[PDB]
Design a protein around this ligand. Sequence first.
Ligand code: BO2
Lengths: 242, 241, 198, 233, 244, 212, 204, 250
Amino acid sequence: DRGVSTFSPEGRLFQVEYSLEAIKLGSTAIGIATKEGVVLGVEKRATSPLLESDSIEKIVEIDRHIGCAMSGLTADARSMIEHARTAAVTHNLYYDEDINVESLTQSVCDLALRFGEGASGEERLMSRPFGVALLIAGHDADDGYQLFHAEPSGTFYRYNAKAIGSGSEGAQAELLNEWHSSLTLKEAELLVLKILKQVMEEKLDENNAQLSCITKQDGFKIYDNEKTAELIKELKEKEAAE
Amino acid sequence: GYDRALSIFSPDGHIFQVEYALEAVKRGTCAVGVKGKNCVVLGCERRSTLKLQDTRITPSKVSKIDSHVVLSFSGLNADSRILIEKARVEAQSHRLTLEDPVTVEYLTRYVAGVQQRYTQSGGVRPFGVSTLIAGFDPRDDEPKLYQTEPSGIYSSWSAQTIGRNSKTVREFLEKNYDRKEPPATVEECVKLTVRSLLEVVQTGAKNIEITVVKPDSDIVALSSEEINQYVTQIEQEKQEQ
Amino acid sequence: MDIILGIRVQDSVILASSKAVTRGISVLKDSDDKTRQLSPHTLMSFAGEAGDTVQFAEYIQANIQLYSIREDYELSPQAVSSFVRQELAKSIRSRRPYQVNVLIGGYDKKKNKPELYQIDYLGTKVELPYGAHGYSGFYTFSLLDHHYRPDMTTEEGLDLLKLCVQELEKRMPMDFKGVIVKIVDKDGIRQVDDFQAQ
Amino acid sequence: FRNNYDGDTVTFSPTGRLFQVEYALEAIKQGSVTVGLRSNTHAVLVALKRNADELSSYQKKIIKCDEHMGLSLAGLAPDARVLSNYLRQQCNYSSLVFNRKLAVERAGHLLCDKAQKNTQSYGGRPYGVGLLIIGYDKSGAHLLEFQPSGNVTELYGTAIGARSQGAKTYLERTLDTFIKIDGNPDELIKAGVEAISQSLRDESLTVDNLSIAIVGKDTPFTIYDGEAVAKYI
Amino acid sequence: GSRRYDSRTTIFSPEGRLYQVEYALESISHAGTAIGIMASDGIVLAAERKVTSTLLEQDTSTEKLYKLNDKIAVAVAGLTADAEILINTARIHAQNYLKTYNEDIPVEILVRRLSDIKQGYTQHGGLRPFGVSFIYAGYDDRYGYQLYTSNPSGNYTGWKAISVGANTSAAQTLLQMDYKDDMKVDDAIELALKTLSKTTDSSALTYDRLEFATIRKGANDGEVYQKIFKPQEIKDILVKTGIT
Amino acid sequence: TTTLAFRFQGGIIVAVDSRATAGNWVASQTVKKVIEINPFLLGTMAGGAADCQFWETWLGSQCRLHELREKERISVAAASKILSNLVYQYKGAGLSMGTMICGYTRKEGPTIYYVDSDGTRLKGDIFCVGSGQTFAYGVLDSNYKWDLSVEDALYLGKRSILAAAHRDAYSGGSVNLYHVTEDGWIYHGNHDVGELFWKVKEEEGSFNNVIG
Amino acid sequence: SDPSSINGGIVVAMTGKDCVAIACDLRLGSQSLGVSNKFEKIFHYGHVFLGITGLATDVTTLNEMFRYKTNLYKLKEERAIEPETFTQLVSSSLYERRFGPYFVGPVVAGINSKSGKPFIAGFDLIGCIDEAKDFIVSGTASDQLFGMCESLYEPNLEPEDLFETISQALLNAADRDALSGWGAVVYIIKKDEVVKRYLKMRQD
Amino acid sequence: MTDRYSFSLTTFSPSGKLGQIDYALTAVKQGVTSLGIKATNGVVIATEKKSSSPLAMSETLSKVSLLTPDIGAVYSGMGPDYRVLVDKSRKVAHTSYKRIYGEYPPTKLLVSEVAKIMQEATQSGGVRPFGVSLLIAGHDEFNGFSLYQVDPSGSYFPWKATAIGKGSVAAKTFLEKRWNDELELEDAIHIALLTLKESVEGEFNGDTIELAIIGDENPDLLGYTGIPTDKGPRFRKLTSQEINDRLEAL
Ligand SMILES: CC(C)C[C@H](NC(=O)[C@H](Cc1ccccc1)NC(=O)c1cnccn1)B(O)O
């Protein structure tokens, strides 16, 4: 066959590129960073009305100051979150302080390229790259509210706003237009909800999507359904107003 | 020694070995779970390729993981034993360290994690198994039902089915299960479970087994007669119209 | 060394275990239950080195419970005691042996006979009508040699224990803060809540 | 032909080529341009940082290895993280064990040998990144070019990445002028920014778009970005 | 490297089947038929010796029937050498159990273990599976007489009567027809010999082409006896049943 | 060292001294012998300073990990068993700790666990640990009732440490006081023995022996 | 301190005319404290008999080990192990633990089923074989047993006579040992039958 | 470096064949004929010394090997494969038997060990099956005289008489006519010599033919005296001269 870490003639890693295709098939996730916080939203996308939608967990806490959202092969994300949590708690054990959001993201990205069938450099025992992308959001004293996009290539970019998953290219153009350095948190919540509403196949309600933020004051919160539902009432009333 | 990457991505972004593991589930005998207001019922079909079996000693389809949690499955029988054992071991480990039995969600997350691990480790193939895990958290009287699959994904269902012709029985449950008013009783829960299997099994006293899980470790399997009394009554409703 | 006694009567096995936990100069606790239920019809009491004691008991408990789930069946007391002995037998030649002595009392639902097994930290096992670990036996074995009958009732067996505990309270130098008493019979394991004054 | 001999790094082609290594080399060309150049007193790195969206950050290209040594990257960024990290450790080992700042030449040889091991063994892969290493050691200012094939070259100047050929011809032309630009940091950087602008096409080099690094005589390796590179635009 | 030559023994087909298990099963189907029948007072194992010659010493021979325990035995269909590897580990497992608990190993526990070893060769290690199907005949004090079957997949099931190897379908149909729950061992003996006699791919069913065994509570003891039939004993019992 | 924890009507009282010694040398009079594991969990320290401080700070991390993993507060039983089981791994290596893990979960009510480096783990209502324990026990045992007010309980705790600080050469410095309810622990101050002693004598008539 | 003197216990074997005999005491102690008077130290695999003295935990372990190995042997060999062969299996099994030995004094007795020849042997804790034609002794009263045997014994005794001899040898040796006694059992092994008798003795 | 062939090289084909085992048996078919015959008081194994050069000294290459004093072996197929199996067979007879019961293993068990070594070459990573079939003949106290065949798969079967390699089908037939259960050892040696003459093309003498027996104990072959129970190996290789003597009464 062909080695799992083979380059293409264009100079790309076959497995990483294919991994990226798996992510395009995943549920939409959107993050927006403001000076009042970072909002993280996802499309639940239940496969049946018998599925208890609130058991869909695609937004997770890493630490009080870091949360993340996932898109793609979501089962692949469990050990990534486990590593992230451990890195955060561990850092705090060694340094009596919060880990920086960037350092946390870098740690997670370090895991990403540890795949192969025995590569000469260190012990990469993972048979394939992860099939999931992550949006890591948080706050720290030095560099404020931050949003990172962590890919299975080991690279991570910082974003003012970012969408990953099925509707991502569409959602991204919409984010390109709507984002400015002055949004408020409320404006950002509404804006995630709106963009998610455009790209989603079902009718977006408080059940088939989920919102969350991370602020300096209260940490990472996952909004309960009743709170999001009122924001959904509220987005409809402003779109009707013009 | 043997660490060949068997589960890899193909060009369109699929992992075929996992996808094919699902095909193994599709061939397994059907399995269904419905939660009542105050119980969970697990139903399984028995195949008829061969008959002359010893039902006393033949491994039954529903497995106790602990006194309060049960597991059923569709797919490769042999593969399922590997999962059941790891789950039973973990259950005792949890009681040993935490001093509390596992929650149904905890146990489900463990089994799913094992499943996932086998999709990104050298030299192994995915489990050709999907599971239904059901029961009650220690000291909860709120019934729990979860489903796992070869990929390692898991989630909770009011009612779910897996295996051959699960497509059919899901249809039945979808237009027959109301979340507003779960089956109020063990009896009307069991009856809904048999009904769903009767869509697929096609005449089945000895072809249907039912386990009932009630709160605080009350788990019983029904006998043929008890089950057959449900089959008899259900077919009388059809002719009375 | 905690008081650890056991007596097999007609239809049950009675276990009595001292309640005190003393560390150096102080009695830290006077209501310590030096016992683990291994299965619905098998009980184990234990005494020895501080940590090893509970650590060993709970580890045996976890294993028997695992067996019960895998097989949907309860091992005979003879099987459970053989399993325990083997664990202690390995333990003694390892880097840090478990310093734990145990009594296993079981009701064998297959035969309908009570059974008492004494096993020390070396993995020395013997089946007995009555047994003890540590210094307890030095006072109690003679009482029991005198007063024991194989057809005694559970109530007679409790009176005979009361005699043993009275002798220990008179002649032993330590205050062991009384015993917790448990009966193992056809119907399971129960605790006599009234031994403080019976 | 080619298709039958490019499966892994352990396979020679009939002409003696190693295609997997050549494919790694292609990741460099697809990378954003970076430039390095030196006098006898200083050495400079200039890099054009790339962004994904106008909502994205520009990905960092310059890594510090010691107080006297650092590098710029073109290609797979994670591979540069692995290799700079190794270099960081070697720089570190030299100090702890020998109380000695590692010779830039010696760092060159170490990186060569590390890359090589991945071009001859099964299940491994070549590194997919090019590196430009500058430092100031006991024999003065230094610039190095690292190729994933293992080839490390000492130079006065060079550039790697997309459209890098522009700057390379500029530096080759400027050679006699910049080699003398001693005791004046701002003029050496100016020559570097002029070199890197000979490789522009797409857009202009902006404030958060530039990255510059400097090391020399009495200057510990320092990274300049944003506002701090403004006086060079 | 090596990857080139790897047959990948443990992958799924697109239809979700295991190639190597299926082909092993195909190999088993050519092997001499073995029959197991459980009665109320005992169990019968019978098997057809595949390929024979005048010069084959039958007195010293064993290829199909193996003693695992004093209370458990197996009939083999498939590669004898593969079976012996498995049989030996099974004997060890039984003794490990006996040493641990001071009780003979319950029949299922042993069967599950052997089935687990087979299952492993199906999921990891890149080796071919064992080309073996087992019929287990045993007694224990929880379930009485038991009959089990395991194959290269590592799946196992319990039966009142079963066959493995060649012509199972025909043999299964024949057993389904004539088997009755109230059967005695002596009736079971006759059923097994009839069934093999009706499914042989040879002209006629002679003693030299059989191995025979019974697990009986032989009533005068109030304990269970494994009888491996000697060649003469098969020749006798073949006459009684009316095959000569 | 003297540390105590007792369970009563109002929850948990935790009281410790603050002295460290190296032989007869007083190394510190300002040691913080209570570790705030979380808003609802406290640990006390007796024996080896390093051993206790390190492994109880570590416990905090293991508890925080639990809550991220199970989306719920760690139980007192589970927290204590972590430290217990860890310490048991090291049995015979020479770890030296006498420790109390105190918390108030909904499921267990107010709960105290004693954990030491021998691997002993005990649940109970009253514990005193340290070289001055026996002194604390005399005062505590003779004035304890379940039905003590939060005020009286806080005082009995504080007074028990005072007793031990006085007689035990290796106890002293100051008293640190905690009250635990389901809402979480509440700090009730640092009371220097140098001023507390005279205050208590005068107001209580106790310590009649000492000339003052 | 001495693992060979904790539980206490004696075993003795003798050859006679077309017979062998093996005997043990029944005591299981823990220093001065008698714990059990039913602790038998003779075991048998097929027609081969083994008595073990020494540390009780090792006595039990070794029995379970030889049961295990003789079971496997019989399955492969399709015959019962013989006294000569078993003696070798004991030896190599003990020597295998040379520097962490079992604290036992094993004794083998039996009649070869093929040859009718009476056979006894004794071992040290590390497997050295002593194959006497007359008697073997083992345990905390071995000095006393050597004395009794060296006087009481004569060749070619009839099973009924050999019984009287070996019983006196054991009884009188045990009564001079604080750690032996509390009952006694004697096996008279003939080709055809094996008789087992419990003796009456002092219970102090 | 490092053996990275951790996977089976023998696998099942769709028809259920194990290819490499078949191919090994094919290699056995090309090999020089060997045979064994079991008498009432002995066993004989024989084969042809097919020398590869008249410059070679054919005595320096024995095809009949002693495994224990009472057990001998011969083969058909690949010579070097056989040689290493002999080394291993001899060793396993010690490590798994002599060092444990102080006696040499009975024939069936040593066979059983050899067979296992061959089975493993059929399943383990990175190996090919052995390209040989063995005939193992021996004696032990409790089983008496006994002949076994071991095939590349690891299967073995007991024989009254048989032949393997080149002319096996013809030779097996010739043995079916001549064999009875009353054969004395000398008679069996005679049948062996007749049967092998059909297989040999060229010269047929004590230099070309390699023949060994398992018969009576040979105290003259022991090397020492003084232990009554050591009464000498039952395995004996016949000399060139001993063969020629029996070829004149042929
Ligand atoms: C837990 C610590 C902080 C408190 C006290 N321990 C110490 O002072 C121990 C010695 C000691 C004394 C009495 C009993 C046990 C151990 N001292 C230290 O750990 C210590 C640490 N750093 C500097 C000097 N001493 B204690 O338990 O009396």
